[PDB]
């Protein structure tokens, strides 16, 4: 039935794609670092694209992963930025959900003229207890079908907790 | 090695050859049969890259001719003083050993450096002697 079927936030990953290396990248990394409380990780570019102007391996994006109640707090701040309204398209078939926001001023960092303005992508990964079965090195296994997270369960949880409503489209 | 052998028929136009111990660049190749029974002979007309003289040699087609190694290298000017260019390599290396060009290329380069363009110089190496052939201007990264 429901002894330990309770959904929880596995992680919150915050992604910023400035698109080109240098001073921006450092400013976006500083914004991510002060928001998370952790140092962020920059991610290299896989392939050279001319139209974007990117080449291989210049650390073109910066992202951070936060777990636990701190991640829950930043998700609360993101949802009150989004006014607790999310599209049905935002949720995925696996049960994970994300949204994208513009500027950290709405998050309330306040503005420095040097640092500029950078928007963010918030993504929440949802799992039940017992997810260690896939992650552990010894006796790695696949999770059973009933215990899997799904879109209907995650939208029901998102309606019940955070007292939010989903948009029909 | 500095130079490597090749066959006359393996040679073709706009390639480098050694004629009378000079690095030369071919402008003309022509093969004519020696006798009806015999093999064709290759007549080669080439221009020395450094001096501009016209040198020709005819050989059997199966004969092997000497071929130099020619490297073209890209540098930025620093100064033109006393007829010796001072150049600057990528990673910041600097050479002053190159003598300035003495012709209309040298005159145009001198006027361009006097009126202050950023000049991109192509210098070639072949068989231990060094010279500058052409210059452009950097359209970006001003």
């Amino acid at each position: 039935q429901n002894p330990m079927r309770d959904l929880k936030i596995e992680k919150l990953v915050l992604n910023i794609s400035v698109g080109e290396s240098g001073d921006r990248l450092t400013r976006a990394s500083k914004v991510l670092e002060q928001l998370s409380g952790q140092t962020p990780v920059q991610s290299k570019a896989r392939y050279t694209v001319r139209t974007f102007g990117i080449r291989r391996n210049e650390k073109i994006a910066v992202h951070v992963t936060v777990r636990g109640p701190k991640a829950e707090e930043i998700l609360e701040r993101g949802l009150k930025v989004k006014e607790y309204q999310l599209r049905d398209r935002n949720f995925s078939a696996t049960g994970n959900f994300g949204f994208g926001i513009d500027e950290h001023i709405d998050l309330g960092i306040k503005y420095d003229p040097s640092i500029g303005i950078f928007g963010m992508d918030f993504y929440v990964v949802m799992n039940r207890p017992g997810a260690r079965v896939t992650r552990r090195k010894r006796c790695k296994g696949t999770v059973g079908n009933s215990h899997k997270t799904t879109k209907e369960d995650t939208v029901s949880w998102f309606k019940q907790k955070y007292d939010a409503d989903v948009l029909d489209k | 090695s500095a130079t490597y052998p090749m066959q006359c028929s393996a040679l073709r136009k706009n390639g480098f050859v050694v004629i009378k111990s000079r690095p030369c660049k071919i402008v003309d190749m022509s093969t004519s049969k020696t006798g009806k029974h015999g093999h064709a002979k290759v007549h080669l007309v080439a221009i020395d890259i450094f001096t501009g003289k016209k040198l020709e040699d005819l050989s059997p087609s199966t004969h092997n001719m000497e071929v130099p190694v020619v490297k073209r290298n890209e540098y930025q000017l620093l100064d033109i003083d006393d007829g010796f260019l001072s150049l600057m390599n990528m990673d910041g290396d600097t050479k002053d050993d190159v003598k300035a060009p003495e012709g209309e290329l040298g005159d145009s380069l001198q006027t361009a450096f006097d009126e202050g363009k950023d000049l991109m110089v192509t210098i070639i190496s072949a068989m231990g002697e060094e010279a500058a052939i052409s210059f452009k201007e950097a359209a970006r990264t001003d």
Binding site: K137, R138, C139, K140, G141 | -
Partner: protein
Amino acid sequence: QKDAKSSAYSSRFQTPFRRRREGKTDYYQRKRLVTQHKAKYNTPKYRLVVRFTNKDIICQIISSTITGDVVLAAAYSHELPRYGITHGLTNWAAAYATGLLIARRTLQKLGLDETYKGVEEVEGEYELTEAVEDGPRPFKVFLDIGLQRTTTGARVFGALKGASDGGLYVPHSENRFPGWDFETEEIDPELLRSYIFGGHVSQYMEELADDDEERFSELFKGYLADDIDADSLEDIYTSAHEAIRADPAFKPTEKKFTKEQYAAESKKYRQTKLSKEERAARVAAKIAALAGQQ
């Protein structure tokens, strides 16, 4: 509709080995362990297999035959109450005591125990069981840590240290023991001795009992139930060590029942297969049910 596998896929699929499918054996490591120099013809190669489950430490001495692996002697951590260790059956010192127990047990049953007494007075120094002259060589054994991560401070090396001080000749270097400084390539013996005698749990016991008492009631509850304070665990480790060096003889349990007595209940509880005739009756009833126009 999405998670569908074709018959061509399931026909061309090659399964791995069963232990690899279960995720319990690294066969790349197993080949390098159990193979022998062929000029040593039928000489067995012996593995100290150390495995860590929750609530247990498993130590075995295992050689390999074609029909299967063969165990000389095994020593678990749940028989440490016989030697006086009741709490912390998976800590680093429990791994040490289990290694010491399996070492003393193997040298006793091989008869190599009156010689090669091992490290009687333990101090935390790094040394190996050297060969005594004009006599038999010490028993040589190699670790099998399995899929477990090699890490400076891991308790597979505590099991190694216990087995090495028990008199086994196990080849090892000292750079994975706790107390190994990385920048100065030397081993600190007093921290390793503190870990052998349980210093890392007793120091935590003190530094948590002085300030946070609800945690001191949540964990270490059995220590208060058996009135074990912080300093006495050192001497109960010492008494456990001398009890092991007294008798590792391994009296087994009395099993409370018989094999067929357990088998009767478990055979009653296990589910059985459906035979061909009743399967045919089942599918005939199904045809008469849904396809029989309800």
